[PDB]
Symmetry: C3
Subunit: 278 residues, 3 copies
């Protein structure tokens, strides 16, 4: 492999995070006060890393941080039941741990933490974060395994109820790339409804990484994946591989969803920066 | 492997089953008159076993037994069309067969019967058992392959429309375990609606067993799975592995579903029987 | 393997297709004027083949051809945005390409085009073909990999909203086979709703081909699969394997869907042409 690959993990990382009410009434996570985003900032670690997150809730209501897939003690559950939420103006240190796969004492295989995961609130609105998730308190988490292929760029697409990344319908978001770029997509679904994520002119493997192991990987190759609330998957593609440059549509394939504007553009540019037709 | 493993099948097993109307208007299967349950009793066999079920319908309406995955002749279809239902007060002997995987005469690979399956009624209410399934006429079936890891306990979680195991919302059910227990979950969905099964602090493999074959198994590791009517899957987890004891929530992640009480507790106790915080 | 297997691809194939308004108001694809069908004709190629489709839109509204999975340039996108639709009475030549899997220059594995895909309209009614898909402008595409097992017959089952193959509910369609036949099913879903495809007495692998690679294939074996709009999968079964002849039901397992008539019959006949009971 002549491409960049993820190293071995084991580092102890520290992070500061805030929950902010936005001017339009939404709620977002951020690494800096005044720089929150919906979806929240991407967190990327390696198998074996430990992450300490000093989380500060700047809003006037209780908020929390809850993560999927990664190892965390009950004190970092992010739920009101386990007293793991954060009071208004408060600060709490969450700890997320990751581990590598390996054989157990009984001989069974313990799975690793690697995967395309996500984090979100769990106490805003209801005891399951229905209000916080609706307001935009969600973000992606990537846990890499040693040797995983590293992309050129990563984009996060969240189907939150009837929006993409809490945006107004018919407003994208759109992304750009050049023919040959290794583009990574993190695909998260939240809210009430099922969806189907579809991409024109591109396909991926329905497995952990979206890439086939090799000639023996039996995982199916798809361009349409059904998703429900709290589903998260990801993949890597070569922009324009075997199809060339163009304005390549991605959208939900539930007919009324795409009709109502749950559509975006994957703009794959020629080496001279042009998109065929435009 | 120093853990208990499933032996080779081939035994001819006999079983007696009843369909009972319950005092509250529900309908349940049972191995003994007056001891019906919703969900019905678990049936567990090994690949190659044959199961003869003497089924007695004690109710005042026609009922039947229909199974997924296992081998059965058209006489054991459990449908009115094939005259395989049971009249009120009647008794009928169903036969379920299982087989091991192997190579066919043409060289192709024939799949085995192993998996996490389920049984349910097919004639109460409608010709597809809509009334019987709603009333609680469903239960799990496990078919083990030789060498499959055996658990310490098995729990069945059924998303039947807007209930868990036909229970009133906000009433669980809850389960208990100790840190280190090998807990098996059988997850069945019935009715009208899609769902997403989610577990806090625990994850499994999205394959036949929920366990990874080894370092080569490309199956994805998840903690959130979308399900539809008649879907059935299962997995095994080590209670508290890498996360410790605590009141670990399992729930549907469709936001209104968890808000309306489709939540339960996986109580993982410390060696001294305590749950952190309680 | 003593069964028929797919050869190596690489041929350049030519095809003529029409879009026709039908007398009942539906819309169908066809290889001949006056011989359109819903679902449209099956297109079957091998990995490496190139397909040139001379498509003629005979209807009074704009129509197009859009394919999943296969390689196509932006000029064959089939969308109004990319000026790839066809005017009333017009003719346009689409090009679909396929490729074999292989190792990239960076050492990564490029997936092949093989799979169970489908084609449909993208501009009738809305800019996503909501009207054309509803009217019946959809059909299956099979891309075979060298060595793939060839079936005795292929049947296409499309869950288009609340219909099977745009048929009136309670009208099938039904299929026939003989015990031992190698039957292939192409299963496509379109429209607004999720479904679950279920088959009595038969099961398949949830992978690319529906067949297990061998003793090492970890893919799950199922008889119930959830599907959403634009999902496409397929499989092969031996008719009556381990279960014998009979009228074997296939249906959606969403309870109201089967109750409303989204049911069909897989009639597996004895060597003398009889179905047990009839
Ligand atoms: Cu939760
Ligand atoms: Cu959608
Ligand atoms: Cu498409
Ligand atoms: Cu969650
Ligand atoms: Cu049925
Ligand atoms: Cu639910
Ligand atoms: Cu969670
Ligand atoms: Cu069923
Ligand atoms: Cu499209
Ligand atoms: Cu359906
Ligand atoms: Cu069935
Ligand atoms: Cu499409
Ligand atoms: O959650
Ligand atoms: O069924
Ligand atoms: O599409």
């Amino acid at each position: 492999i002549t491409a960049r690959t993820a190293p071995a993990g084991g580092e102890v990382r520290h992070l500061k995070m805030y929950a902010e009410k936005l001017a339009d009434g939404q709620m977002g996570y951020g690494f800096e006060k005044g720089k929150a985003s919906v979806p929240g900032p991407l967190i990327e670690v390696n198998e074996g890393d430990t992450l300490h997150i000093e989380f500060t809730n700047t809003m006037d209501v209780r908020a929390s941080l809850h993560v999927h897939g990664l190892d965390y003690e009950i004190s970092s559950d992010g739920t009101a039941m386990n007293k793991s939420d954060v009071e208004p103006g408060g600060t709490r240190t969450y700890t997320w741990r990751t581990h590598k796969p390996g054989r157990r004492d009984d001989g069974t295989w313990r799975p690793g933490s690697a995967g395309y995961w996500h984090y979100h609130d769990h106490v805003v609105g209801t005891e399951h974060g229905t209000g916080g998730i609706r307001n935009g308190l969600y973000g992606p988490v990537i846990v890499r395994r040693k040797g995983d292929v590293l992309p050129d760029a990563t984009h996060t697409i969240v189907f939150n109820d009837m929006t993409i990344n809490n945006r107004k319908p018919h407003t994208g978001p759109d992304f750009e790339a050049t023919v040959g770029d290794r583009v990574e997509i993190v695909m998260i679904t939240h809210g009430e409804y099922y969806h189907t994520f579809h991409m024109h002119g591109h396909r991926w493997a329905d497995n952990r990484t979206g890439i086939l192991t090799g000639p023996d990987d039996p995982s199916r190759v798809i361009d349409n994946k059904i998703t429900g609330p709290a589903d998260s998957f990801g993949f890597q593609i070569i922009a324009g591989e075997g199809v060339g440059a163009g304005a390549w549509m991605y959208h939900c394939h539930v007919q009324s969803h795409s009709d109502m504007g749950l559509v975006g553009l994957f703009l794959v540019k020629k080496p001279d920066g042009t998109i065929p037709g435009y």
